[PDB]
Symmetry: D2
Subunit: 249 residues, 4 copies
């Protein structure tokens, strides 16, 4: 059919959910990938299908690195083709985020989760996306990669690797007409359980309005990058951070 | 009431495309120019034919000098005089030519033109833009600087031009930080190769085109304008201090 | 009270020159290797001939797996076993080969390219830091000046090297309170791949503004020596490009 | 015989340390100064006491003006006159003060000083240095700033000048590589604090630095310059070495 289709990873909640909704509002059919949040994913799909029948499906997968991750990533892309006959956009949003101090989970599990979700799964999804082909990929990066959270080495390594993928894939996929870009939030949606006192500490550091980005503001940048208004843009990462990364210690 | 924009060096090429696209989006525009009077007036006539009293021209040299601050203050004042407001500033005007380090313009003229157009004038226009707002919620004020995706892999023998564009990156960042509390966003658009020089031969143009991964061709002026329009829009209201490369992957390509 | 250094992938090429220069500077060295056993033992022999009991070898595969943490721990332990201390870690070992997006399985390619270039450095950094509770301690990561202008079809490799820049920064921040500095050296073109043909090698050489030639291994090693030295005691989280201007050259 | 170096702004603080360490390494030195004649001569006297006729001074204002090209030519010429050669240029002199965007010196004077010292003078000195050349180890070292991407509030012009200096470093490295002239930078974070800065403010800055919660000594900055001019950096050009104790890694 004539409406384009997008895969959004980690789409049940928060930023991924807002991205899925905005893509849907723009006219895309969506694959809502999720790991543990089945109820939320299904709720979103039902909402979107109420708006337009047969325009949303869910796809469950763990994006932890392992021997089966390549197959899992191939399956996610295939789900979009099975549902909608095409796959125009891939949004790599899903992400593990927790500290891994240099000095519970084994360290190999932490590597698998943090590097898998933030870098390896994006790479494998990118491979599967390209092999099956205004086509574009958008990677959710992090404006703070050069001024990282203390004791978040593996997470930071994963997001750095994702910048490399964005560049490498933009270069390699350009001949196929597939653009590859990034959106780099600073502080957006905070953890719900984070105390407001801690939330406000982060908010007050942001020059532009002393507030976090909404999920919708992050989604707006993704929508620009997949649009016809970005058709010469490839290998670019758009910071959406309210000036946070410009603020010295 | 429609918002108003100043676009420097807007008579032709990329600056014209930005002015046109802003005007199509609903802005009133000040078309600043230096030598290209006929082209500036022609553009303003076309825009005014589309919507009466929505375009004016403003002449100024943006070469650095002791009067440049007054010239820059006057450009911003022209927008307020014509339209009663100034919501957007686009720093597009630019001198571009080689200044070899080893060997009829004096070097001091070259510094004045290359650093003036690309960096000092943007700074002064930024100051004047910000100061004029002090006499004013639904507002959406911003500045867009035309940067250069190739600043870290520069053209051979273009040191002063390169220095000017690096300075413009610094201004983008410094002004984003300092003007955020006033609700003025400050961002950049960094072309790779877009409209090639008028005097460049076709063989040389094709040499540049063939290096671009995405389509083996230069950006259209409209493609560059699209990124400016995004940055001024409500879809970018949390974006400040960002420079969007619009280069078809050119900067990713090794030697 | 000679300090001791671990250099990964030290049997040949750049890692060998690093081990040699560290030894010349007065370090005792652990020559880590994977497959190049003969070269590793030959080097240790040369170094021990110069100063007895100053070099040992340590074999390990640095491919990512569930045993990699134990392997990395063992490398660091080998330094303490031999020398009773470990002052310097040089993360040099590296897999480098294309992985196009469009008979190794992709999972093996991920494990080798991301393991050697990023995960092993991380685990070795962890083990190095945790063994320190007893100076001029530092870590040097061999990065790549071309990470932002990467080789076509080397996505996994490039991801690994980007991850290595992240580790360098993150570990510099986190280990600064323990006095452990963490920096990088980023070659452009240095010793060319053994499998590369002469015409192709010459193509790469001609790209380099400063002398139209590749860096020697000794030139790369000179920057490592500086970073571990007393003349770099306030330097942490810095990556020194050693590329003859190659990265400045547009397409 | 011995190589020769020009260090701008060499009478005090970081520039003085750089000149001292180059001299100790075996260089003859031109000590450039603007207002600090007494300190400049005191340094030369100290260095000449160590090795006769190995240090001279050169006065010049590095503010941008119509005479700045001539002034920069003279600084380079002074090295050739004293020592018959000029192997190293260190661009250290620098104006540093706020220039707020929203509201003493006029703005154009502030442009002349901040952009002149931090960028235009280095460009003109680079040009003169290269023109006068056209085995050897010729290089230029620019004193940059590790904080350029997380700048001081209200320091737009200073920041623009330092960004321009990054651009010069890269452009000149590319263009001068065929002549065997390397061009690099050293980027301090917090080193010797402003003389006017209050002691409590100094401590606020010190406590931000991960590596030792202190500023860099001038000698530590000089150590990186020494490396860059040495034979141990013969393949290094277009590189900027941060010497910041991890300060630039620390988020807000
Ligand atoms: N929030 C911010 O301030 C911020 C700042 C910088 C960057 N970003 C980036 O923006 C993106 C969105 O951020 P966010 O805060 O919305 O993310 P988030 O809530 O932390 O995580 C998004 C989703 O990732 C999925 N996920 C986590 N582990 C997974 C695994 N092993 N396999 C498959 N999926 C997994 C989860 O899906 P299920 O719930 O279904 O399990 C989760 O809902 C992320 O890439 C993040 O790094 C966010
Ligand atoms: N074209 C590209 O491929 C490319 C690549 C990278 C970056 N960019 C950037 O994008 C912007 C637009 O590029 P472009 O090619 O359209 O620019 P351009 O044609 O070279 O110049 C734009 C205008 O700048 C004005 N200008 C030059 N010197 C001036 C002075 N002393 N005072 C006042 N105005 C002066 C001229 O106005 P008058 O004609 O009225 O005299 C000219 O029409 C520039 O900032 C440029 O650096 C372009
Ligand atoms: N050469 C250059 O032009 C260049 C350019 C940019 C960056 N670099 C970086 O500089 C460093 C040294 O470069 P180089 O060319 O000397 O490296 P190299 O020869 O390609 O590799 C160095 C050593 O890495 C070891 N290694 C490879 N896979 C391994 C594995 N699975 N487990 C354990 N060790 C493994 C090998 O040891 P065994 O031989 O014992 O098996 C090999 O001898 C690398 O990090 C490289 O990425 C080099
Ligand atoms: N100190 C730090 O923490 C720090 C941090 C980042 C970067 N840096 C950089 O490191 C370098 C040295 O810093 P510093 O603190 O030692 O510098 P500084 O004391 O502020 O200035 C050094 C010298 O610059 C000269 N100078 C200033 N204006 C001049 C002019 N118009 N004409 C000619 N010379 C002029 C002065 O010479 P006279 O005294 O003879 O007039 C002054 O002594 C500078 O480039 C600076 O930006 C320093
Ligand atoms: C201060 C703060 C802000 C947001 C979060 S959620 C988060 C952040 C991130 N970079 N990646 C993912 N996946 N989730 C946690 C702490
Ligand atoms: C390869 C090429 C492409 C476009 C141009 S026009 C131009 C370029 C620029 N960076 N700034 C200005 N002002 N004009 C010249 C050469
Ligand atoms: C142009 C060129 C020069 C040297 C090599 S060898 C090499 C390079 C690399 N970046 N990592 C490793 N491990 N080995 C390959 C290509
Ligand atoms: C936190 C701090 C530390 C040192 C200074 S002195 C200074 C700094 C600079 N960047 N340039 C020059 N020329 N002088 C000012 C503030
Ligand atoms: Na780039």
């Amino acid at each position: 059919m004539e409406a384009p289709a997008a895969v959004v990873t980690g789409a049940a909640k928060r930023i991924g959910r807002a991205i899925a909704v905005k893509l849907h509002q723009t006219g895309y059919r969506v694959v809502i990938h999720y790991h543990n949040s089945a109820e939320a994913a299904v709720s979103l799909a039902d909402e979107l299908n109420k708006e337009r029948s047969n325009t949303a499906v869910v796809c469950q997968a763990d994006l932890t690195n392992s021997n089966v991750l390549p197959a899992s990533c191939e399956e996610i892309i295939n789900s979009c083709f099975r549902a909608f006959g095409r796959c125009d956009v891939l949004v790599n949003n899903a992400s593990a985020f927790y500290p891994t101090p240099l000095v519970g989970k084994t360290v190999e599990t932490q590597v698998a989760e943090l590097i898998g979700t933030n870098a390896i799964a994006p790479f494998l999804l990118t491979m599967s996306f390209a092999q099956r082909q205004n086509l574009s990929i958008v990677n959710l990066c992090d404006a703070m990669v050069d001024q990282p959270c203390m004791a978040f080495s593996l997470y930071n390594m994963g997001k750095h690797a994702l910048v490399g993928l964005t560049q490498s894939a933009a270069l390699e996929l350009a001949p196929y007409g597939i653009r590859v870009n990034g959106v780099a939030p600073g502080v957006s949606l905070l953890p719900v359980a984070m105390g407001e006192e801690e939330k406000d500490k982060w908010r007050r550091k942001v020059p532009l309005g002393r507030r976090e980005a909404s999920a919708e503001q992050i989604a707006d940048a993704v929508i620009f990058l997949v649009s016809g208004s970005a058709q010469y843009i490839t290998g670019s990462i758009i910071k959406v951070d309210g000036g946070l990364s410009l603020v010295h210690a």
